[PDB]
């Protein structure tokens, strides 16, 4: 339906920007109607790191342990740890989820990358036979909110750090596609040690603002699961008659898959295909 | 009734951020239901300047000439000059009011003080007898809403140009709540020339998530016209009632009724007191 949003947070001070972002939409979403919980990582002492020890009781092989099978055995079982069992509950009530976070690195912070690492377990969250539009997240929906110290002119086609489309397409299609999640626009504020007290207040009303209609929100596109020949003879490989039609456009059909063509614009940050 | 609003603009270029505020407003307020009308001053081309012209035909009496006099009889019959009447019938059936301008010298542009001087006439806009919340235009709100080249923290109580509530008080006092309008909050936008870009479009969607309920907004607070003698015997001089109990009041009741103490704290910049 539209009604419970969990907002996943990675930042230590309450006094960023970043702080300032969750309080604004808890605020917005409650004011209409919606259920909303709370994943403030560094205020919950969250252990980043995967192991042996995120498994109860006994392995199936501790002399080849590997992680993927381990995992979605004590997840049938009811072996995990207490810490990941809490999070994965959260997410299964959620119908919104928000990931709130600085860009570090040109990427996520480490205790939001571990979060995935340790709360995503396989026959949970994915399925190496139901990958992408098939994933156990196709009723759900979720969009990335990120502050930046470079300017939005550092970010595009012909500044130092190239294109911000690019730097999103590990993330919003590699780990949130990937289980089936409806991936909307992110929210981006570029260069926020930068622009003055007043203005960064007009930041956070335009936030809340575009909370007020976010479930009905058109997403962002992926090419379909169902283009793909799925088995090891094939390869996992785009279907002949998709390759044949594919010869007359001028565009790849997206970031990852440019197809050696041009890339359509602003494909991992403007909504329709 | 609550459905027409007028916006009065005061610049010459189509790329700034005031026509920029502008067109955000229109837009905002006709997705809400509103009627909309517009007086762009330099596209209308609009003469600033009173003079013995603006009357036609019979001046009571050319040898001593007196603007007030004058008007406000050639008001009565008829006797404007066109453009004069053409501006005089928006504001008639306006609900709402918004002037948009620029801070030029601590004040407002000339073209906009001149369009104070000839279309807010003598016997239409006010009358001595009827100063302040006794005024024709008491069932109508109004706003200010401001650019500046200078930061928010130049404006401030300890700045170096000193209090932003002194500079809007001739204003929003002597010439909105004399002639009988319920003053709101000005929306102020300071340093846009060193506002990074993709701030100054959530300035601008800010701007429009306040227009969703305008008409529902408390006034800014003026002393009421009951409080004071209003005759030249007594010299329009707070009620000595008045003035015993205010004795044991440690701030001021306004801006220009300081009193001698203490000034209540962004009288005319945040509503209610
Ligand atoms: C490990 C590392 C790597 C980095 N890599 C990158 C990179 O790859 N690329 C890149 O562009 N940048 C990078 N950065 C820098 C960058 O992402 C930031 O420092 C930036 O995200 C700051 O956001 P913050 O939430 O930490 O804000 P803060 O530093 O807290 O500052 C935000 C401003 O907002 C103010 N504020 C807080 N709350 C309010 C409020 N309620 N209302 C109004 N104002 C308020 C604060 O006073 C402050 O002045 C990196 C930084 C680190 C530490
Ligand atoms: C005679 C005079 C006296 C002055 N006195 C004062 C004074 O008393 N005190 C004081 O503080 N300042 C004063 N100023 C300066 C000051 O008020 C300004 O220059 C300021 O208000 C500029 O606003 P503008 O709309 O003219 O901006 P512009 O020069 O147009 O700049 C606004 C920026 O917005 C950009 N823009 C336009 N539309 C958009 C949009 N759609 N979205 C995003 N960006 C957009 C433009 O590219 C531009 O870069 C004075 C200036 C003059 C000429
Ligand atoms: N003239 C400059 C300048 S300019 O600022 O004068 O425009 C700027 C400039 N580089 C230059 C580029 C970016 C930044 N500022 C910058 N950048 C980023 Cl990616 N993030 C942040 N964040 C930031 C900003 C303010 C407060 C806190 C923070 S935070 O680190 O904690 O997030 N600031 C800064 S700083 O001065 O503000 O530190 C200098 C250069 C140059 C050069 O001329 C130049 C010539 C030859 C080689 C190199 C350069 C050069 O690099
Ligand atoms: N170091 C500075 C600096 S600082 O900017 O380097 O911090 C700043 C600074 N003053 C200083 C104050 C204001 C502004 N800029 C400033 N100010 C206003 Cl009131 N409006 C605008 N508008 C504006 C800004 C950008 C683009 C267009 C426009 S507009 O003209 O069209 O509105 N800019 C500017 S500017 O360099 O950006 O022009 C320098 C000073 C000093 C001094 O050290 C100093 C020492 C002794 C006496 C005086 C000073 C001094 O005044
Ligand atoms: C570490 C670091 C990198 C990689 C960046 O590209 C930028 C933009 C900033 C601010 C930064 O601090
Ligand atoms: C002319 C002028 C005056 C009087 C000011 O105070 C400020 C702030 C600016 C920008 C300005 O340009």
């Given at each position: ?14 006094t ?7 309080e ?105 036979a ?25 970010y ?10 690019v ?80 010869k ?16 359509p ?9």
């Amino acid at each position: 339906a539209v009604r419970r949003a969990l907002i996943v947070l990675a930042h230590a001070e309450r006094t960023s920007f970043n702080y300032a972002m969750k309080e604004a939409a808890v605020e917005a979403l409650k004011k209409k109607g919606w259920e909303v919980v709370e994943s403030d990582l560094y205020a919950m002492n969250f252990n980043p790191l995967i192991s042996r020890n995120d498994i109860t009781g006994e392995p199936k092989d501790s002399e080849n342990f590997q992680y993927p099978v381990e995992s979605s055995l004590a997840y049938k079982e009811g072996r995990l740890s207490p810490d990941i069992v809490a999070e994965q509950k959260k997410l299964e009530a959620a119908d919104l989820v928000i990931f709130q976070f600085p860009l570090y690195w040109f990427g996520v912070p480490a205790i939001l990358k571990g979060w995935f690492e340790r709360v995503l377990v396989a026959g949970f969250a994915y399925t190496y036979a139901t990958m992408y539009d098939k994933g156990p997240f196709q009723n759900k929906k979720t969009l990335l909110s990120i502050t930046t110290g470079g300017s939005g002119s550092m970010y595009s086609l012909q500044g130092v750090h190239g294109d911000m489309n690019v730097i999103l397409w590990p993330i919003q299609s590699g780990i949130l596609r990937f289980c089936g999640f409806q991936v909307l626009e992110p929210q981006l504020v570029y260069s926020i040690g930068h622009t003055p007290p007043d203005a960064r207040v007009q930041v956070l009303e335009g936030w809340k603002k575009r909370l007020e209609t976010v479930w009905e929100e058109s997403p962002l596109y992926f090419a379909p699961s169902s283009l793909f020949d799925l088995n090891f003879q094939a390869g996992f490989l785009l279907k002949k008659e998709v390759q044949e039609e594919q010869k007359k456009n001028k565009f790849g059909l997206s970031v990852g898959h440019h197809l050696g063509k041009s890339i359509p614009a602003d494909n991992q940050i403007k909504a329709r295909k």
